[PDB]
From a paper:
In eukaryotes, the core Sec61 channel forms a larger translocon associating with the multimeric translocon-associated protein (TRAP) complex and oligosaccharyltransferase (OST) complexes. In the Sec61/OST/TRAP translocon, the TRAP complex aids ribosome docking to the Sec61 translocon and participates in protein folding, while the OST complex mediates N-linked glycosylation. Phylogenetic analyses indicate the inheritance of eukaryotic Sec61/oligosaccharyltransferase/translocon-associated protein translocon subunits from an Asgard archaea ancestor. Asgard archaea are predicted to have a complete Sec61αβγ complex and many of the components of the OST and TRAP complexes.
Residue numbers in the entry: 466 to 607
The structure:
């Protein structure tokens, strides 16, 4: 069926996780714009990464109960896992593309601009689907 108790807890947990992940991006942005000392960066990120590890541990029992129902809830959670990983990959891809471009190792400015635009769209597309699937879980409760 649908375990309302576990789902109600899980929805709050994954919103908090999505929020911390976006705070990590904010730290990443502050770093490359040199608006934060790398002292405060590696400190704050290691602190955020501990909140994540602890939230991910706490979510384990609820997530297992939810995935063992199969069907649509299981499917949504699996996509959320995928989309989170995909957004991380795109993040590292843009950073690499930027280093490869400033070192003059790309064919052309037009190629760089098209690929980087592609990656920014993919970042928004991934985050869009994450928010949508979080809202689909929430709709079970609210």
């Amino acid at each position: 069926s649908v375990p309302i108790r576990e789902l109600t807890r899980f929805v709050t947990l994954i919103e908090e996780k999505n929020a911390i992940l976006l705070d990590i991006e904010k730290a990443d942005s502050d770093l490359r714009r040199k608006r934060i000392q790398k002292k405060v960066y590696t400190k704050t990120v290691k602190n955020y990464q501990n909140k994540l590890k602890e939230l991910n541990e706490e979510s384990i029992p609820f997530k297992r109960i939810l995935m063992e129902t199969g069907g649509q809830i299981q499917s949504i959670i699996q996509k959320l896992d995928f989309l989170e990983a995909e957004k991380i990959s795109v993040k590292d891809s843009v950073k690499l593309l930027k280093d490869r471009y400033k070192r003059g190792k790309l064919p052309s400015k037009a190629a760089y601009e098209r690929l980087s635009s592609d990656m920014i769209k993919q970042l928004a597309s991934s985050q869009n689907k994450i928010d949508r699937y979080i809202n689909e879980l929430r709709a079970y409760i609210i």
